[PDB]
């Protein structure tokens, strides 16, 4: 009767990594797909910040794993970029689009390549990442690895 | 060039008021923006940095700056519940009835979130209670859809 501001509190809890708070908010009807003005969701924030226990909680409540914020970020982009292998693995096992492109044309593979996350690149390739995809700078993941002189990465991408 | 713009966006995001002043003196564009049209004032409003808002105002920032999605900084502050920032933006003449790309005014967003004290101040500064977003909804309609009886009582009298 007096409104419930649980969506905002969930976003704050996911961003802060308050694992028990996320559980409690979800147990009391908080919208698992809450978002802010820019479409950023608790799963986006957990994925970028590396909060695996929170990711798993949201997965218990049927979160949209492929939600895009206003910038074209999906949770898989964000975990791949910031090097959170365990979250990447989980998202891929829950049906996240492996070749989703953000507003820069980057797939998760591009982002993992830019940051030198070799294990993440490997699991992305295992789940069908497209090595031919060019971002809107015209770069493949291979091109990025060469631009960065990352020999190990260039070896993985052939 | 736009190197100072990037630096100013980040100083506003981080709440570094001394760095803002330094960058303005270096020739930074007070209305610099990223590729999404998001300005330092947008980031200060989003992050709740009242002091940054005050400093940018003194350096002639445009409080009606709109991003790619039609958000002014007033949208961001009103959606997140930042009373002080909402007040100072209105006091410096921001368009209280600015609409984003879905026709939402700040009153709509504040209604969606149940921010009663921000609804009060928005109304005080001339918010349009009859404004409809692109879904045909007024702020009063939103409060009915949400079951927020406190909010509806405020708005229904209007």
């Amino acid at each position: 009767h007096h409104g419930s501001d649980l969506g905002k509190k969930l976003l704050e809890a996911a961003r802060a990594g308050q694992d028990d708070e996320v559980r409690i908010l979800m147990a009391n009807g908080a919208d698992v797909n809450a978002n802010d003005v820019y479409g950023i969701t608790p799963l986006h924030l957990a994925a970028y910040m590396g909060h695996l226990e929170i990711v798993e909680v949201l997965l218990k409540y049927g979160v949209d794993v492929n939600a895009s914020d206003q910038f074209g970020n999906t949770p898989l982009h964000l975990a791949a970029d910031d090097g959170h292998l365990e979250i990447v693995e989980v998202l891929l096992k829950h049906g996240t689009d492996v070749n989703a492109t953000d507003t820069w044309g980057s797939t998760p593979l591009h982002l993992a390549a830019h940051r030198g996350h070799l294990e993440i690149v490997e699991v992305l390739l295992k789940y069908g990442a497209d090595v031919n995809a060019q971002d809107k700078f015209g770069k493949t993941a291979f091109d990025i690895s060469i631009d960065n002189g990352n020999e190990d990465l260039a070896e993985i991408l052939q | 060039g736009s190197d100072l713009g990037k630096k100013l966006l980040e100083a506003a995001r981080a709440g570094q008021d001394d760095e803002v002043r330094i960058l303005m003196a270096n020739g930074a564009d007070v209305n610099a923006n990223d590729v999404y049209g998001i300005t330092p004032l947008h980031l200060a409003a989003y992050m709740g940095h009242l002091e940054i808002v005050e400093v940018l105002l003194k350096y002639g920032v445009d409080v009606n700056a709109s991003d790619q999605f039609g958000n002014t900084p007033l949208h961001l502050a009103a959606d997140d519940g930042h009373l002080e920032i909402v007040e100072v933006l209105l006091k410096h003449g921001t368009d209280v009835n600015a609409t984003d790309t879905w026709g939402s005014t700040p009153l709509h967003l504040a209604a969606h979130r149940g921010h009663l004290e921000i609804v009060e101040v928005l109304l005080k500064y001339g918010a349009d209670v009859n404004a409809q977003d692109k879904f045909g909804k007024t702020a009063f309609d939103i409060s009915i859809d949400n079951g927020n009886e406190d909010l509806a009582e405020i708005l229904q009298k209007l």
């Binding site: 924030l45 507003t103 | 995001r13 992050m47």
Partner: peptide
Amino acid sequence: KRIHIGPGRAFYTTXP
């Protein structure tokens, strides 16, 4: 968290 280049990464960057 340290800022990083990328789409809207500012909004994902708070505190350290």
